[PDB]
RNA sequence: GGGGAGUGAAAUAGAACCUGAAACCGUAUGCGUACAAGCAGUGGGAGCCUACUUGUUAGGUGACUGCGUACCUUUUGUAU
């Protein structure tokens, strides 16, 4: 099971932890996260928004060129573009129990592959960077995720200036940090958080 | 890693895109054919 | 000292220390080669040729090498009928050595 | 060898050709004889060029004005002032005032 | 995301130019005339490599048609005589025997003569 | 307008000034063309020149010779 730190195994519920990899699923959730954070900030000009191009510049015969309607036209070199795109939301609807189970499946492979480092318990005393750096030099880790119950004000001011350190929380984390980041710290007060959460 | 997964074989295809080269398949046409009602913008028939 | 040699569904005029290219056989590089459908030998004045082939003749090659040479383009092109096809091309061959004319 | 330019001169590239020509490959002294009495505009424009060219090789270098042979002479274009010239029924065409680069390059060799 | 394809396009042009030099005027130096250069010469390239083994079959007919002649044969019944046993030598290394090793040929058409056909 | 001399890492970064291609227009060396008829190419191929490792190898010319009526669209049908 998960040998914390303290060498004290806890026996997780085996329905979250420890299942079955289904990559295609995950692809999936973090595929729609990842859509999900974009803006949709974009704005182009179709032919009726350019100024001007109104009248035709010529007649329809007798004149030897070829036949145009408006100066502001997508074949002409001023006129707007064809299909300019209005600004639109990217957010794709993904399901409730299709996310957890996202969740409870990568959380299975961070088990497999040793990411997952399951510690008793992780505070800081004051705000300081290095006060955190010499604490992460304690376990050895870099380029770490921090998992916690409840993100306190002390953690959060330390490891914003941090370079490789994220602080999130249960209710924060997202399909996308947990396999970003090379490892991801729990605590054992999360990994019960965990259980309602998921199964 | 975000580097390595991918969808499963045949979840996504690739959006055929009509008008673009000859060995496409969609070439010079789209699939519309020749001179009609069905092969002009706004080309379609009442329901 | 001139052979005809059947090789690869074709003969060539083969001496007795020429390197030849030959369409590509199941054989490893450096190893010895006898053919056997060898259809006439001559030796100065002295040629013979075979009824169906020439008996108790033989020639020994060796291989020097393989790869592929000269690569050719084929345009498939139907004028005025929106259809066009490109595809390549490069024909194994053999290289061999001549030893002896038996 | 040295060399004199002149990028900018009001005739056209093509008329300069054909004195161009006419002195590729001749020694100077009578290079500078057979423009000093050539009746275009460009024997002017390119005596001018050859004796500067001359004065280069004898005041940067030791070359005598005997032994240099204009060896290397080519003209190409150069920029063109566009204008317009009013025509009949209101029509209007544009008129291209052209320019060229002359080149002469001399050898003491 | 805009793509401007200024880039791309120039290394078919290039492509298209490299296979079309050494052709005259402007099929070797403007793209639009080049392609069509290039489209029928790899039509004519298509169908030469089917033609030259009819020319070179023609040609080899014709030499061991001059070969013969000389001996006191046709061709059409020096093959009649060759086919009478199986002699089994192929055109291309017959009309290279009729030109350098003549005294090979004429004791190949000696032994077709004696075939009696 | 140029040829020098100097500045600058670099003036073929010299003000019409980073890179600076294609159409277009020239100058040099190699080869072929003034008795030979047509989508200008392709298959074969003499001679010449340059290169080598000194030619049963490499590159550029292509005398000569068999076949060969461009691309797109509209069409029952196009060199048309
Ligand atoms: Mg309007
Ligand atoms: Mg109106
Ligand atoms: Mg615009
Ligand atoms: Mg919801
Ligand atoms: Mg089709
Ligand atoms: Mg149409
Ligand atoms: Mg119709
Ligand atoms: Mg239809
Ligand atoms: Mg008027
Ligand atoms: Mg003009
Ligand atoms: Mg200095
Ligand atoms: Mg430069
Ligand atoms: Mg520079
Ligand atoms: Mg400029
Ligand atoms: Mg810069
Ligand atoms: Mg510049
Ligand atoms: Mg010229
Ligand atoms: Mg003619
Ligand atoms: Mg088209
Ligand atoms: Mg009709």
Same mark, same amino acid.
């Given at each position: 099971?998960?040998?914390?730190?303290?060498?004290?195994?806890?026996?997780?519920?085996?329905?979250?932890?420890?299942?079955?990899?289904?990559?295609?699923?995950?692809?999936?959730?973090?595929?729609?996260?990842?859509?999900?954070?974009?803006?949709?900030?974009?704005?182009?000009?179709?032919?009726?928004?350019?100024?001007?191009?109104?009248?035709?510049?010529?007649?329809?015969?007798?004149?030897?060129?070829?036949?145009?309607?408006?100066?502001?036209?997508?074949?002409?070199?001023?006129?707007?573009?064809?299909?300019?795109?209005?600004?639109?939301?990217?957010?794709?609807?993904?399901?409730?129990?299709?996310?957890?189970?996202?969740?409870?499946?990568?959380?299975?492979?961070?088990?497999?592959?040793?990411?997952?480092?399951?510690?008793?318990?992780?505070?800081?005393?004051?705000?300081?960077?290095?006060?955190?750096?010499?604490?992460?030099?304690?376990?050895?880790?870099?380029?770490?995720?921090?998992?916690?119950?409840?993100?306190?004000?002390?953690?959060?001011?330390?490891?914003?200036?941090?370079?490789?350190?994220?602080?999130?929380?249960?209710?924060?984390?997202?399909?996308?940090?947990?396999?970003?980041?090379?490892?991801?710290?729990?605590?054992?007060?999360?990994?019960?958080?965990?259980?309602?959460?998921?199964? | 890693?975000?580097?390595?997964?991918?969808?499963?074989?045949?979840?996504?295809?690739?959006?055929?895109?009509?008008?673009?080269?000859?060995?496409?398949?969609?070439?010079?046409?789209?699939?519309?054919?020749?001179?009609?009602?069905?092969?002009?913008?706004?080309?379609?028939?009442?329901? | 000292?001139?052979?005809?040699?059947?090789?690869?569904?074709?003969?060539?005029?083969?001496?007795?220390?020429?390197?030849?290219?030959?369409?590509?056989?199941?054989?490893?590089?450096?190893?010895?080669?006898?053919?056997?459908?060898?259809?006439?030998?001559?030796?100065?004045?002295?040629?013979?040729?075979?009824?169906?082939?020439?008996?108790?003749?033989?020639?020994?090659?060796?291989?020097?090498?393989?790869?592929?040479?000269?690569?050719?383009?084929?345009?498939?092109?139907?004028?005025?009928?929106?259809?066009?096809?490109?595809?390549?091309?490069?024909?194994?061959?053999?290289?061999?050595?001549?030893?002896?004319?038996? | 060898?040295?060399?004199?330019?002149?990028?900018?001169?009001?005739?056209?590239?093509?008329?300069?050709?054909?004195?161009?020509?006419?002195?590729?490959? &001749? *020694? $100077?002294? @009578?290079?500078?004889?057979?423009? =000093?009495?050539?009746?275009?505009? /460009?024997?002017?424009?390119? &005596? *001018? $060029?050859? @004796?500067?060219?001359?004065?280069? =090789?004898?005041?940067?270098?030791? /070359?005598?004005?005997?032994?240099? *042979? $204009?060896?290397?002479?080519?003209?190409?274009?150069?920029?063109?002032?566009?204008?317009?010239?009013?025509?009949?029924?209101?029509?209007?065409?544009?008129?291209?005032?052209?320019?060229?680069?002359?080149?002469?390059?001399?050898?003491?060799? | 995301?805009?793509?401007?394809?200024?880039?791309?396009?120039?290394?078919?042009?290039?492509?298209?130019?490299?296979?079309?030099?050494?052709?005259?005027?402007?099929?070797?130096?403007?793209?639009?005339?080049?392609?069509?250069?290039?489209?029928?010469?790899?039509?004519?390239?298509?169908?030469?490599?089917?033609?030259?083994?009819?020319?070179?079959?023609?040609?080899?007919?014709?030499?061991?048609?001059?070969?013969?002649?000389?001996?006191?044969?046709?061709?059409?019944?020096?093959?009649?005589?060759?086919?009478?046993?199986?002699?089994?030598?192929?055109?291309?290394?017959?009309?290279?025997?009729?030109?350098?090793?003549?005294?090979?040929?004429?004791?190949?058409?000696?032994?077709?003569?004696?075939?009696?056909?």
């Amino acid at each position: 099971q998960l040998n914390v730190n303290g060498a004290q195994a806890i026996e997780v519920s085996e329905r979250t932890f420890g299942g079955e990899f289904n990559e295609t699923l995950v692809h999936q959730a973090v595929v729609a996260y990842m859509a999900g954070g974009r803006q949709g900030s974009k704005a182009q000009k179709t032919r009726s928004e350019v100024s001007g191009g109104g009248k035709k510049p010529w007649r329809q015969k007798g004149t030897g060129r070829a036949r145009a309607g408006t100066i502001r036209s997508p074949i002409w070199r001023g006129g707007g573009t064809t299909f300019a795109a209005k600004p639109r939301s990217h957010e794709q609807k993904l399901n409730k129990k299709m996310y957890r189970a996202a969740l409870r499946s990568i959380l299975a492979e961070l088990v497999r592959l040793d990411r997952l480092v399951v510690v008793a318990d992780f505070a800081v005393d004051a705000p300081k960077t290095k006060g955190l750096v010499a604490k992460l030099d304690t376990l050895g880790l870099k380029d770490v995720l921090i998992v916690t119950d409840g993100v306190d004000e002390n953690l959060y001011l330390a490891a914003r200036n941090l370079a490789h350190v994220d602080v999130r929380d249960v209710q924060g984390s997202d399909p996308v940090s947990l396999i970003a980041y090379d490892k991801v710290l729990v605590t054992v007060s999360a990994v019960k958080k965990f259980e309602e959460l998921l199964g | 890693q975000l580097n390595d997964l991918r969808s499963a074989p045949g979840a996504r295809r690739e959006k055929h895109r009509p008008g673009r080269g000859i060995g496409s398949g969609l070439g010079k046409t789209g699939g519309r054919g020749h001179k009609g009602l069905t092969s002009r913008s706004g080309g379609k028939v009442a329901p | 000292m001139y052979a005809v040699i059947v090789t690869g569904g074709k003969q060539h005029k083969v001496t007795e220390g020429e390197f030849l290219k030959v369409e590509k056989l199941d054989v490893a590089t450096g190893e010895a080669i006898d053919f056997d459908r060898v259809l006439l030998v001559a030796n100065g004045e002295d040629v013979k040729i075979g009824l169906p082939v020439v008996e108790g003749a033989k020639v020994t090659a060796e291989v020097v090498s393989h790869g592929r040479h000269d690569k050719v383009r084929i345009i498939k092109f139907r004028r005025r009928k929106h259809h066009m096809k490109r595809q390549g091309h490069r024909q194994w061959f053999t290289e061999i050595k001549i030893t002896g004319i038996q | 060898e040295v060399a004199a330019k002149l990028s900018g001169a009001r005739i056209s590239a093509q008329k300069a050709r054909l004195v161009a020509d006419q002195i590729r490959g &001749k *020694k $100077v002294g @009578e290079a500078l004889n057979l423009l =000093a009495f050539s009746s275009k505009k /460009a024997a002017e424009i390119m &005596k *001018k $060029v050859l @004796e500067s060219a001359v004065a280069n =090789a004898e005041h940067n270098e030791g /070359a005598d004005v005997d032994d240099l *042979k $204009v060896s290397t002479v080519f003209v190409n274009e150069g920029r063109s002032l566009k204008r317009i010239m009013p025509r009949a029924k209101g029509r209007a065409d544009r008129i291209v005032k052209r320019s060229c680069h002359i080149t002469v390059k001399v050898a003491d060799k | 995301a805009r793509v401007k394809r200024g880039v791309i396009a120039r290394r078919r042009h290039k492509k298209i130019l490299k296979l079309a030099k050494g052709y005259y005027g402007a099929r070797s130096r403007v793209f639009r005339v080049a392609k069509q250069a290039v489209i029928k010469a790899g039509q004519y390239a298509y169908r030469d490599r089917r033609q030259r083994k009819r020319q070179f079959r023609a040609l080899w007919i014709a030499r061991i048609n001059a070969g013969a002649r000389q001996n006191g044969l046709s061709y059409s019944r020096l093959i009649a005589g060759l086919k009478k046993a199986a002699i089994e030598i192929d055109r291309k290394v017959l009309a290279d025997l009729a030109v350098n090793e003549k005294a090979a040929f004429t004791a190949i058409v000696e032994k077709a003569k004696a075939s009696l056909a």
